[PDB]
């Protein structure tokens, strides 16, 4: 209707913006992502990029009134948590630096990060190996709890003179396809886990949910293109969901670790703790190790 | 394009127009993010009758992301417009499209029939002074401060379906004299709670600026529309100025008496009024004694 445009309507900004390797749709009210898009394959988790040159900025082309800025995120208790990791784009730098805008990233707490979630995003670059493409769509989520006398209550922290919105859950679509000639029905699974520190004693289907739930949840229609009368199998049935232990996990932190030792003594207290835990080196651990002990010999 | 082999998701955020109002629905909250409206002397004009629309679910939103009636009825909220139904007594079919919950917000009963319908009312009245007005209001949910500074939202959601009760409730009201008038444009910004608000608080304590009204919602208002260009304060070349306890007190007093069905209740109307201290003006006593006529002449 012309007369009720004559000054235009109000903008929402949730158009889909696109990236080098994820796109994403803004929340310019909470300053974090609605959804962040993804694709991953072999060879785009491989390359030289290396996130320690990677800086957290905000996203230039968010409109700065809505978007969030590092001085909201840096000593609020909460960590800048990708939703695209930055793992996922070690083939292109330019790529790996706009995971670093803010307009992907959401308060996430420190140990979830480092932890669960992390070890989820490896789980998602494991499948890589077992299928040609995969799909991830990863956000936040506020959802409600009990109250005292039976309501039900949406209660989140917000952060930062800008009001970064907190969420109390995160969640990700994984959609996996064996091939682009393959006649097998896609493989797919929601999961959604608390924006806490989660640790190792439970699975990762105890945070699945089924697709449908999670749409009434976050509002959002995942993968609008598939038809879901076809056979969709489910990813925990036909693949394994199983994150890594603790002492896989430990062996793959710890071999991490080896590139930033500085020094011989460094270096070898990596070994310590990794003994103490009666965790053996693996090969891999081992080459690593015995490369940059004498690196490290080579230097002043 | 591999991303979007299997589609971007959907955020359902899209402008979806109607008769006289239009609206950006949010699904996850089941609630309008904005409603817009354009309003007119005419427009508020006409025989479309209130007692004849119903609450319904939006036909055009997917069932999965709708509100129904069993999630406001016994809840403690009131199903409560965004686009008033009394602005479009010129239209049925206008006035029924604003009974679709799309446009529909758990509003607190006071609140509704009270502080914000007196808005309304206000809104309204500008089309005596300007010829047209557009009007988009919507629901907010602020943070709260604890006393050690944490700054946390937090809101009730009703229903199965989990619809969120907003803190507060915006309107913003851009005002134009003629579409040949070189007076410039007024536009007013403005943030209630959504709780019972007395009469003692004026409009213009809930003025904000368009500023900040948009950081705190996350929208771009009348975008089209040029800031740096001649735009007033519209509590500086209007009044800003709700009716009082008496104005308003006989405005729902005179209306009560058109759904008096008995002769012993209308003469209460009558009662509640004096007993209220406020004097029927001649608008009360004429359609009161011709109601009261008509009451003689069925059983
Ligand atoms: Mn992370
Ligand atoms: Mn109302």
């Not at 930062?160 to 699974?189: F, M, Q, W």
Request: aromatic letters at 10%; proline letters at 5%; one cysteine or more.
């Amino acid at each position: 209707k012309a007369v009720l445009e004559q000054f235009g309507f109000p903008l929402t900004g949730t158009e889909a913006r696109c990236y080098t390797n994820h796109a994403l749709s803004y929340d310019q009210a909470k300053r974090v992502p609605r959804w962040v898009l993804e694709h991953i394959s072999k060879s785009k988790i491989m390359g030289d990029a290396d996130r320690k040159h990677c800086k957290f900025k905000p996203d230039p082309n968010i409109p700065p009134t809505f978007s969030a800025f590092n001085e909201d995120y840096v000593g609020s208790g909460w960590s800048r948590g990708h939703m695209a990791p930055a793992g996922n784009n070690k083939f292109s730098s330019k790529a790996m630096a706009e995971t670093f805008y803010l307009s992907n990233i959401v308060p996430q707490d420190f140990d979830n990060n480092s932890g669960y979630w992390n070890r989820i995003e490896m789980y998602c670059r494991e499948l890589t190996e077992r299928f040609e493409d995969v799909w991830v769509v990863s956000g936040p989520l506020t959802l409600p709890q009990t109250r005292g006398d039976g309501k039900k209550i949406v209660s989140y922290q917000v952060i930062g003179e800008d009001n970064v919105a907190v969420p109390s859950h995160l969640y990700k679509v994984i959609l996996a396809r064996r091939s682009s000639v393959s006649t097998e029905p896609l493989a797919l699974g929601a999961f959604v886990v608390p924006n806490e520190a989660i640790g190792f004693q439970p699975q990762l289907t105890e945070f699945q949910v089924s697709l449908q739930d999670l749409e009434k949840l976050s509002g959002l229609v995942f993968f609008p293109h598939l038809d879901r009368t076809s056979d969709i199998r489910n990813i925990c049935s036909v693949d394994t969901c199983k994150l890594l232990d603790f002492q896989e996990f430990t062996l793959y932190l710890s071999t991490r670790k080896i590139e930033g030792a500085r020094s011989v003594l460094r270096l070898e207290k990596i070994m310590e703790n990794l003994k103490n835990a009666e965790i053996e080196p693996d090969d891999y651990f081992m080459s690593r190790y015995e490369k940059k002990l004498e690196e490290l010999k080579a230097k002043e």
